[PDB]
């Protein structure tokens, strides 16, 4: 398309999910040249949807994959490769260098942001149209981070949530509103949310909704709802007792709309939700202590009701298999009356639970909604840690 995108539709009814994309990265990367990645996501241009992830500068099999448990180094880069290919050395494309990213297409071209540097002197440079436009230095000197899933734009404005400061406390979260890679405005986190990490966002009907991570005290997730037209936001938590961070305490009967739900402290996992009244689905790990399994539950009015319990559900990865990061994306340039809600799950593999190998890496499963009620299967990464020995 050659004109800015405007979020003029609402979600479609979510009555089950169907597979959209599957990688099989780690099973193929046992013999081919696949790159070690982590923090995946998916994002669509008007033209194509592509898988996106943070790379580690080595292939699974090469000797340099030893040590990729580590989150940030100067050999990480945000790459892109076609939907359902593995992230190969030969078909990947680097969008920028850094260890935390977000990227989105405003309708005319795309914004990609990589953050880089030492933990006390990190920088973000915002690439607009494969050229570096603006950069932002750190403001609280402690690991400036950002989304790890796509940003969303409305008429050229693309809000992006950044956090800088402790992960075990108060930190400094700001919402930036870029347009054509330039900073129109920015604001501090405002709302009842206590800490913000790795927001997963989608937009419909001119409003952007982000479901995030409270790493400091939450087991229920902060929601930030942004108005890209007035460039303002509010934050609250999901009211539902169906707790969705991980690790988590056991689900209560009454949740907490304005406060962290108490139980696990100083930990979390990136996660998403489609919050649309009765049409609300939530994703969560099946395990309470670990990144294993992944289910999607329909919990109507979960955002506002502190007694919301599931009414339909769907198993995406069995609890006997590993899951990991999850986030949302939508094909905004898909034809039709409404938007088809989609999500991805990161399937982490390697260190530290499967320490027999010295790499950590992952693969991708993505699903998108249907209105049919479709049968469910589960979707394992699939590799045998024993053939890499």
């Amino acid at each position: 398309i050659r004109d800015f995108n405007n979020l003029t539709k609402g979600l479609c009814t979510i009555n089950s999910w169907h597979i959209y994309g599957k990688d099989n990265a780690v099973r193929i990367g046992e013999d081919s040249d696949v790159l070690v990645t982590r923090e995946p996501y998916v994002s669509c241009d008007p033209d194509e949807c592509r898988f996106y992830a943070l790379s580690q500068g080595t292939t699974i099999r090469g000797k340099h994959s030893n040590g990729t448990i580590h989150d940030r180094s100067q050999y990480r880069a945000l790459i892109s490769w076609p939907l359902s290919s593995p992230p190969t050395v030969y078909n990947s494309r680097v969008e920028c260098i850094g260890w935390s990213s977000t990227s989105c297409h405003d309708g005319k071209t795309r914004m990609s942001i990589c953050i880089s540097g030492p933990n006390n002197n990190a920088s973000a440079v915002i690439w607009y149209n494969r050229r570096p436009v603006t950069e932002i230095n750190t403001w609280a000197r402690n690991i400036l981070r950002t989304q790890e899933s796509e940003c969303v734009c409305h008429n050229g404005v693309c809000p992006v949530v950044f956090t800088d400061g402790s992960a075990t406390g108060p930190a400094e979260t700001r919402i930036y509103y870029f347009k054509e890679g330039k900073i129109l405005k920015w604001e501090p986190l405002a709302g009842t949310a206590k800490h913000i990490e790795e927001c997963s966002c989608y937009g419909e009907r001119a409003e952007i909704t982000c479901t995030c991570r409270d790493n400091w005290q939450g087991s229920n997730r902060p929601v930030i709802r942004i108005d890209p037209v007035a460039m303002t936001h509010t934050s609250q938590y999901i009211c539902s007792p169906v707790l969705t961070d991980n690790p988590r305490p056991n689900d209560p009967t009454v949740g907490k709309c304005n406060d962290p739900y108490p139980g696990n402290n100083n930990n979390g996992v990136k996660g998403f939700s489609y919050l649309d009244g009765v049409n609300t689905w939530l994703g969560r790990t099946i395990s309470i202590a670990s990144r294993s399994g992944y289910e999607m539950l329909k919990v109507p009015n979960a955002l506002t009701d502190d007694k919301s319990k599931p009414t339909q559900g769907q198993t995406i990865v069995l609890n006997t298999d590993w899951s990991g990061y999850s986030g949302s994306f939508m094909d905004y340039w898909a034809e039709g009356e409404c938007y088809r809600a989609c999500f991805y799950v990161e399937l982490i593999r390697g260190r530290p639970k499967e320490d027999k190998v010295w790499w950590t890496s992952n693969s991708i499963v993505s699903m998108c909604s249907s209105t049919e009620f479709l049968g469910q299967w589960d979707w394992p990464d699939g590799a045998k840690i024993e053939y890499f020995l």
Epitope: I286, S287, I288, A289, S290, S292, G293, T315, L318, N319, T320, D321, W322, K353
Partner: nanobody, 120 residues
Framework: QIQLVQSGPELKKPGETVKISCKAS????????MNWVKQAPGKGLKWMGW????????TYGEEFKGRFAFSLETSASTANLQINNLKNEDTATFFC?????????????WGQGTTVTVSS
């Protein structure tokens, strides 16, 4: 709700084999694998391995790779421990524990124990 009820305690002379059952109740067998733990008379608690009640693949602790064999009557929600060529120092109590997650890092819900006394 969840009950893991184990077989009763056996006596076996050295060299014999034993099959200890663990019948699961209250959960869907298939989404939660089984931990087998040995609490030896003095020594305390030890992880013997975990069985993927979905695929059926067992992991053995290195101490247990060999004479020990995990299997399951899937169909009846039973997991079983089989210790072949019983050694006299295998007298102890074996617990099946449900593993909360993949690999069983958490044993929420343990069975009653089946105590073996290897003795001529």
């Amino acid at each position: 709700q969840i009950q893991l009820v184990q077989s009763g305690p056996e006596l076996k002379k050295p060299g014999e084999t034993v099959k200890i059952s663990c019948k699961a109740s209250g959960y869907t067998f298939t989404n939660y694998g089984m931990n087998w733990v040995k609490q030896a008379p003095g020594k305390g608690l030890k992880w013997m391995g975990w069985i993927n009640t979905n695929t059926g693949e067992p992991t053995y602790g290195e101490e247990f790779k060999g004479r020990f064999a995990f299997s399951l009557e899937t169909s009846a929600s039973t997991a079983n421990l089989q210790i072949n060529n019983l050694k006299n120092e295998d007298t102890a109590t074996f617990f099946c524990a449900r593993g909360e997650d993949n690999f069983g890092s958490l044993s929420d819900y343990w069975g009653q124990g089946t105590t073996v006394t290897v003795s001529s």
